[PDB]
Amino acid sequence: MEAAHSKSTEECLAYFGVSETTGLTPDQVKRHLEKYGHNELPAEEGKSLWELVIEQFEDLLVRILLLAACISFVLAWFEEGEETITAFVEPFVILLILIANAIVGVWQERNAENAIEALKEYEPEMGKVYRADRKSVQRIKARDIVPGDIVEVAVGDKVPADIRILSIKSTTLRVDQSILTGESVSVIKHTEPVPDPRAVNQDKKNMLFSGTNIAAGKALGIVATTGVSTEIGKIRDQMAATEQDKTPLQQKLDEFGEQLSKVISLICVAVWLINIGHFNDPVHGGSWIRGAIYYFKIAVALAVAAIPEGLPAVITTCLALGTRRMAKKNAIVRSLPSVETLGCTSVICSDKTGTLTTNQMSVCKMFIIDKVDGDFCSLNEFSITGSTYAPEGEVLKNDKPIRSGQFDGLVELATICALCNDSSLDFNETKGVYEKVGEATETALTTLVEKMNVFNTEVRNLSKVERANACNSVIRQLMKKEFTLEFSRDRKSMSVYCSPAKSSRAAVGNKMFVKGAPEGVIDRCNYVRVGTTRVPMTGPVKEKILSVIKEWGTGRDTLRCLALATRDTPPKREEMVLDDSSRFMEYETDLTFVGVVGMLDPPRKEVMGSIQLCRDAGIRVIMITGDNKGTAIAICRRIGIFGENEEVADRAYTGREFDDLPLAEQREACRRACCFARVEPSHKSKIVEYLQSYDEITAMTGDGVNDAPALKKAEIGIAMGSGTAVAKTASEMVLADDNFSTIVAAVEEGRAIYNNMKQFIRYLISSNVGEVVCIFLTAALGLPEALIPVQLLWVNLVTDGLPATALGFNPPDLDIMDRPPRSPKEPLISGWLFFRYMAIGGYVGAATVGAAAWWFMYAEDGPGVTYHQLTHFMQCTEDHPHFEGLDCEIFEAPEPMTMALSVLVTIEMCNALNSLSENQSLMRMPPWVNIWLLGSICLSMSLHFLILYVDPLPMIFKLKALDLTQWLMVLKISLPVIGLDEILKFIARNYLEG
């Protein structure tokens, strides 16, 4: 039964065939449980460790590597020798990286925590129900409650289900519906039915929501809905039904996996199509098996030299590093893949109160009527200084400090601001500053009366903690607070019934002090007060009031106006039903307008600036606020979202206006809007969908499970640090300070970080190019392998990893924020860039094989056989080219490999310097620009040597220390890699910039 709030308490009992005095019967319980199921949100997929481990092998590149370990394993088995201490190293090393890879992946999952499982935090274990099979109340597990159950809740209880309140046993019932919104301000529930069947939760004043808490009172009610049919349950379904796509980088990286694979295969087929000459060879003779071991040997190397094995670690270390860096700037990112996303943010939808504004209220002005006399009318406008909650400030008329007590209208004005208020003050000695107790807008009033002191009461004597509520405590003693009629959006005001203090046997003298939004309150006034006198409200004097109100809340003041009035002749205390809020507007009528107070909720000092950075960065800003349309726009012009004098007729909507627009038109309104005022529950989410249909990377703020759906949908869900824990777990980032600027600062941090990733990404991949050139080269030239898997891996994970990581510290461009949001579609490498790395590739691959050949030829230590070409044979089954000589295993000399490897390592350290800037020369941007890079190179070289002398290692890799001549050769063949790219960059700068 979903519409319970709109039905009568009787209808809800009838509907379920249950008696309030006895409850459900064991039969009914059985059937109700059978039909609606247990009261609890469904479980999450029990992702088993085993399945989780298997997932660590879903990727295509890992399969290849796994496959490669397989061929490696067999090769290191179907081989004939004795060196079993350096034969299985390769296969075992591959398997071992896949293990750490799988091990790491599973570590994440165990620590990761989704928002749906966060919602189960709000469901209580037990509930208290009344069921026929017993007399007294009985407590059962909340999962056993069912729709129709008669339940019982009391102060402190966590509501077990969505409940239609039948009877309030205590004086009044109060609920903390905080988890839905965040504003712990308890609200008063009733039992009368709410008419509108489509009323949003905030107005279902006769309902209790599963997950909320009783702040005060005791109540009996009937269960309307349970499980996923409750409010939070329907919020759990929206979230679950929401799939968050892969980040631009993740998609672009996954696409790379496909191509890289399609290349690794084509290069293998390519190595085949080249030796097709073997078909034309006599079947007899030649070790066929030695022909297959040859291919599979290169297949392994080919694949291992194609995969950027260390890319994942480098990306992570960079993202992890940047994140701590963002956290120092108040941005707490929960998702590493988000850091990249944040950079492409094209639209930021932010709540105003507390994020764009400080949510530190303060009354700045107030006006009462000076005099009425026919068509002539004059008001008395005042100003108040001080903007803290502290009672320090002053009132001034035309800047001249006046004294409140000298004006009667201000005496009463103050009486209303004090008596018609549920908030107070308190001096926090610990912090040394006065803090608010209750609501912001109301404490602003408690503070106001203190600076006003309409009774010139001696307060300067009083301490500090005592000074807090001095003038208030005074006004209170003057009036007894019989009771108070709560605020409700229908009427938009609240009142308090007060009687005099010094009264024994009297039946006259009572008063009602009304407070609320101007339009409604003023429309119910037939009287305007002029000091102590009272005169009728007339057409003109009403314009003046409304006129000013409009000037204060719409003008450069952007003030929230509150009208204050009192009902002189309030209906008799007995003729009033304090049970039907529906009767409150009636009870608050035929009032007398006293005055108005305009309060300000100030823009964070850093917002004005931050909004400009966005404009520079092509990032749109949409303010979502609760202010009426007029003041919403006013505040927009004030912070820079709107031009002070520009048209916005079609860029600011109220939830109402928006709803009326037909689907097609809303989608439109969202592409050009910057202001949404009085937004409905389903709007942040609908605003996010529309924004995505235009491919906008969207950021959306929020808190409370209310916003969790929108948070989850938006690409960058942003939660307040002070927000609920569900809003947090449902978001990409959390604002430690709740400040809008923290968002912008983080978006700029994401642009810096993504630029630096493009660098180490291209660096590493480009490096794999030279490797596949080397391997493919050595093959299509029948040369002795220049480099081997065990080695290639060390370079891709260690040698190249250190530089790649240091590249993330590359200093950011000054124009980082003066350029528009990066397009999600923008490819990493393309066009000229491809040619560049393709060339840089060729050279690196050529240079490695050549460094090997140089030793095998124009070198001493090795055969001086120039143009001898080992291409010819490698079986030595004839030993023709070397008649006189019993030697053929020099083809495996450790020197040639060592020459090529030192070339790779040294060339790549030089390429780490060519990566300091995409197109700027080393002349313009020096190497020392990034000190971390230098350090990394020294470290990587020290490691290279490390494997060259520490015995266990030089054998594992099959290397031998180089001669100063040989090393001096590596430098000669490496160093030129710089001029090469320097030449390529030059071309890019001078013949492409258009």
The mark string for 719-748 relative to Na ion (x by CB under 5 A, - otherwise) is -------------x----------------
Q: Tell me, what DSSP letter sits at residue 365?
A: E
Cα–Cα dist 457/548, whole Å: 31
Q: Which active-site residues does the annotation give?
A: 351
- Closest listed residue to residue 446, CA positions, set 464, 434, 432, 463: 434
**Surface-to-core class of residue 295, CB atoms within 10 Å of its CB (0-12 exposed, 13-18 middle, 19+ buried):** middle
How many whole angstroms separate alpha carbon 269 and alpha carbon 257?
Answer: 18
State which of positions 541-600 bind Na ion (CB under 5 A). none
**What minimum distance in Å lies between the beta carbon of 591 and Na ion?**
48
Query: Of 717 and 808, which CB lies nearer to Na ion in the complex structure?
Result: 717
Q: Closest-CB residue for Na ion?
A: 717
Of residues 856-875, those binding Na ion (CB under 5 A): none
If the CB atoms of residues 113 and 258 are measured against Na ion, the closer one turns out to be 113
Of the candidate spans 179-187, 321-329, 417-425, 711-719, the one that interacts with Na ion by CB under 5 A turns out to be: 711-719
Which pairs from 4-8 meet CB under 8 Å and 24+ separation? 4/162, 4/164, 4/207, 4/222, 4/224, 4/225, 5/164, 5/193, 5/194, 5/199, 5/204, 5/206, 5/207, 5/224, 6/193, 6/194, 6/195, 6/196, 6/197, 6/199, 7/164, 7/193, 8/193
In the complex with Na ion, the residue whose CB is nearer, 717 or 862, is 717
Angle between helices 964-974 and 976-990 (to 10 degrees): 10
Nearer residue to Na ion within complex by CB, 119 or 363: 119
Taking CB under 5 A as the criterion, the residue among 227, 393, 553, 717 binding Na ion is 717
Instruction: Provide the β-strand partners of residue 16.
Output: none
Q: What is the nearest approach in angstroms of Na ion to the Cβ of residue 118?
A: 14
Q: Are 613 and 744 spatial neighbours (Cβ–Cβ below 8 Å)?
A: yes
Give the chain's largest Cα–Cα span: 138
Closest approach, Cβ 162 to Na ion, in A, equals 27
Residues in contact with Na ion, shown as a per-residue x/- string from 613 to 652 under the rule CB under 5 A = ----------------------------------------
Of the candidates 340, 351, 335, the residue with the CA atom closest to the CA atom of residue 731: 335
Distances (CA, A) of 554 to 356, 639, 644, 750, 823: 18, 14, 12, 37, 38
Nearer to Na ion, 193 or 717 (CB): 717
The length of the chain in residues reads: 994
- Of the listed pieces 150-158, 273-281, 562-570, 712-720, which binds Na ion according to CB under 5 A? 712-720
Task: Work out how close the CB of 490 gets to Na ion at its nearest, in angstroms, rounded to a whole number.
Answer: 35
Judged by CB under 5 A, the stretch of 118-126, 715-723, 798-806, 902-910 that binds Na ion is 715-723
Q: State how far the alpha carbon of 37 is from the alpha carbons of 4, 19, 164, 603, in Å.
A: 19, 21, 19, 49
**Is 738:724 a contact under the CB 8 Å cutoff?**
no
Mind giving me the DSSP string for 467-497?
GGGHHHHHHHHHEEEEEEEEEETTTTEEEEE
Q: How far apart are CA 700 and CA 686, in angstroms?
A: 12
- The size of the interface with Na ion (CB under 5 A), counted in residues, is 3
Sole window of 246-254, 284-292, 708-716, 873-881 interacting with Na ion (rule: CB under 5 A): 708-716
Query: Cβ 235 to Na ion, closest distance in Å?
Result: 15
| Residues forming a β-bridge with 332 | 734
Report the Cα 264 to chain-centroid distance in Å: 38
**Cα 759 to Cα 780: distance, rounded to the nearest angstrom:** 31
Estimate to the nearest angstrom the gap between the alpha carbon of 716 and the chain centroid. 4
698-702 sheet: strands from edge to edge? 331-333, 733-735, 716-720, 698-702, 347-351, 620-625, 675-677, 652-654
CB of 730 to Na ion, least distance (A): 7
Kindly state the smallest distance separating residue 965's Cβ from Na ion, in Å.
Answer: 60
What is the pairing mode between strands 376-384 and 395-397? antiparallel
Which of 116, 774 has the CB closer to Na ion?
116
Least distance CB 242 / Na ion (angstroms): 8
Distance CA 335, CA 320 (A): 10
Report how far residue 326's alpha carbon sits from residue 201's, in angstroms, rounded to the nearest whole number. 37
Q: Which amino acid is present at 610?
A: S
Q: Which is nearer to Na ion, 409 or 821 (CB)?
A: 821
Instruction: Determine the interface stretch with Na ion among 311-319, 434-442, 545-553, 714-722 (rule: CB under 5 A).
Output: 714-722
Residue-wise burial string across 619-649, b where 16 or more C-beta atoms lie within 10 A, e elsewhere: bbbbbbbebbbebbbbbbbbbbbbeeeeebe
Strand locations in 149-297 (E): 150-154, 162-168, 173-176, 187-189, 207-208, 213-216, 218-225
Confirm whether residue 133 is marked as ligand binding: no
Subset of residues 512 to 531 that bind Na ion, contact rule: CB under 5 A: none
Can you read off the two tokens belonging to residue 728? 């947090």
* Measured CA distances, 906 to 189, 234, 599, 789, 898 (Å): 75, 60, 68, 18, 12
Closer residue to Na ion (CB): 716 or 852: 716
Q: Which is nearer to Na ion, 260 or 714 (CB)?
A: 714
Which range binds Na ion by CB under 5 A, 26-34, 212-220, 706-714, 807-815?
A: 706-714
* Of the candidates 216, 311, 169, 222, the residue with the CA atom closest to the CA atom of residue 805: 311
Nearer to Na ion, 686 or 762 (CB): 686
Residue burial 712-724, b: 16+ Cβ < 10 Å; e: rest: bbbbbbbbbbebb
Residue 236 CB, shortest distance to Na ion, in Å, is: 16
CB of residue 732 vs Na ion: minimum separation in angstroms?
Answer: 5
Comparing CA positions, the residue from 847, 967, 842, 961 lying closest to residue 904 is 847
Q: Let me know the angle formed at the C-alpha of 74 by 83 and 104, rounded to the nearest 5 degrees.
A: 95
Q: Is the sign of the CA dihedral 57, 59, 65, 70 positive or negative?
A: positive
CB of 920: closest distance to Na ion in angstroms?
A: 36
- For 574, the 3-state DSSP assignment is helix
Residue 343 or 841: which CB sits closer to Na ion? 343
Which of 114, 473 has the CB closer to Na ion?
114
User: Is 707 a known ligand-binding residue?
Assistant: yes
- Answer yes or no whether residue 105 interacts with Na ion by CB under 5 A: no
Q: How far is the CB of 742 from Na ion (least distance, A)?
A: 17
Residues flagged as binding site for Mg(2+): 703, 707
Residues that bind Na ion (CB under 5 A): 714, 717, 732
Binding-site residue positions:
703, 707
